[PDB]
Amino acid sequence: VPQWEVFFKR
Amino acid sequence: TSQTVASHVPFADLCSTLERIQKSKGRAEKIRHFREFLDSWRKFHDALHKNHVTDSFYPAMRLILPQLERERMAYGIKETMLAKLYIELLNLPRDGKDALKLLNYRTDFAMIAYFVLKPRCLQKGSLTIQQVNDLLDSIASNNSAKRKDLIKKSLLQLITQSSALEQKWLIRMIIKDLKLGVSQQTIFSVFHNDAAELHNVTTDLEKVCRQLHDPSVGLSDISITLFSAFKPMLAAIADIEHIEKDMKHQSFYIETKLDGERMQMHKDGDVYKYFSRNGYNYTDQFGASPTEGSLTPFIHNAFKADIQICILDGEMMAYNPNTQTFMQKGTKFDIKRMVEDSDLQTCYCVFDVLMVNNKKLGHETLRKRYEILSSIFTPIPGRIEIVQKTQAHTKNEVIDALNEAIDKREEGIMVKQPLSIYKPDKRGEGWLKIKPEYVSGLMDELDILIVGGYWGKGSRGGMMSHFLCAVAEKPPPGEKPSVFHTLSRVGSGCTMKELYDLGLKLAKYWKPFHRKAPPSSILCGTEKPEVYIEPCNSVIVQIKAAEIVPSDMYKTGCTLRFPRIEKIRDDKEWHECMTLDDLEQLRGK
Ligand SMILES: [Hg+2]
Ligand SMILES: [Hg+2]
Ligand SMILES: [Hg+2]
Ligand SMILES: [Hg+2]
Ligand SMILES: [Hg+2]
Ligand SMILES: [Hg+2]
Ligand SMILES: [Hg+2]
Ligand SMILES: [Hg+2]
Ligand SMILES: [Hg+2]
């Protein structure tokens, strides 16, 4: 399950 | 398994993005910040939903464009309510400068609050965007049910679980004005190339978010669809001098301009939906079926046999059966209530059709569209009507129509290109509107006396169609005016109850007018009334007019262009009538 924080702070 | 991006995205990330957009100076920079958020959301979505989807950007977009919220109803929250709440929670001195400034906020509030919050609320947010939506849902739903305390508790959750900065943005989403410094259209364009066009034929952020979830997949032939709210086509204001050029030097339509509630009707058999011009659902009022509502039960059977599905554009009017007239918006009386008490009834005035049985008609010519319209239903006067239209090609014909329109107490005229198609939310193109050039001054308030009358037709023969109005000749000091000079004929249509009441009040005073033995108190020009009334028995009306022009039809040697009775001035005595001298000074000033 992907974690949002990896997508947003990127 | 009913998984959503919104359940994973801290409301704090949405707010830091709004804060960056609002503080950015350039458009480019504003857009960039939006893009970065939108892009992360889309990549996440793809990762989250790899092995599954109706999920979309809607939970964010509805907070970004709160003025476009349609699912949730009104919150019922006032700045003043928030003010009190914060004064409790932050324990501000009840008589201090901060508390008063919140309570005495003059209609921004979010910013005043934020400055009070910044040094005393240091809490970090805990809500996801989804959880923010859930609490807003709770506020709106409880407001509907007038459950004041539950609204407070939902507010309480939002506030105690959110950072000062998030609270700034919550307040703006609640008020429905974010002040991003970037337009709604820009937001749409940044989101998807097709987003605006789609929004114009579905006033629904969720539909737009979900259908245009992929920025690289377009939609073909975006069009008006059964049971979706499209934005109405609008009319551009038109200077009557240029009307022949404006109509592409060809034949055009002149159509009655009605000031009702713009309303579209969607029909499929026994099922009906109605949308207002902003795309709110009015089906509860008018009727979802032929056994309920204020309109549908009465018009369901007007539709012709072959018609199963249709979509109409038009205007809802309040109709008086006893006078066969539409009541105007501006009245001292209660139109809604009288409609409910059955004193008046709802009447759908229809001027367009966008679908018939699965033929889509947006792209047909208005000419073809009008042809089809006459095939959709059989008009029932006072419930469902086809607005009256005529063909014309001359400026003077348009002058005639405007003249007639104002005479019947309508407030203008419509002019429409027969070649023109239906363009949702566009102003201009094929639709022009024409109203008189009213210059706001003394010209807005001519206080003149009724001196004579003209009868309506047939059964309305007891009511007057027009009044003849005069001004007073200034009388010798001491005595009241005894001589009046005609000035203007003016429409007496019962478009407001005060005119109806006035007619009945004056009924007993009319006397037959005889050309060969005329009353000495009323001096005429060419134009004679059918009946006259002694001045002391009469009433002053306040008249709005665009221009005083020469005329040999009235004793004053002039008359009023586009005159409309604005008010009955029964707070004035008959002898307080505007005089010749007043008229004279007015003309040359
Ligand atoms: Hg706080
Ligand atoms: Hg959207
Ligand atoms: Hg009507
Ligand atoms: Hg009336
Ligand atoms: Hg009338
Ligand atoms: Hg009347
Ligand atoms: Hg006369
Ligand atoms: Hg009198
Ligand atoms: Hg005059």
Author numbering:
A (entry chain B): 486 to 495
B (entry chain A): 6 to 57, 60 to 114, 124 to 605
Question: What does the published report state?
Answer:
DNA ligase IV (LigIV), one of three DNA ligases in higher eukaryotes, plays a central role in the repair of DNA double-strand breaks (DSBs) during nonhomologous end joining (NHEJ). Artemis is activated by the autophosphorylation of DNA-PKcs (Goodarzi et al., 2006). It has recently been found that Artemis (residues 485–495) also interacts with LigIV (Malu et al., 2012).
Here, we report the crystal structure at 2.4 Å resolution of the catalytic region of LigIV (residues 1–609) in complex with an Artemis peptide. In the derivative crystals of the LigIV1–609/Artemis485–495 complex, the poor density for adenosine is consistent with partial adenylation as observed by DNA ligation assay. Although density for the αPO4 is evident, it is likely that AMP has low occupancy. Artemis485–495 interacts with α1 and α2 of LigIV to form a three-helix bundle, burying 436 Å2 of the surfaces of LigIV1–609 and Artemis485–495. α1 has a kink produced by the proline P15, which is conserved in higher eukaryotic organisms.
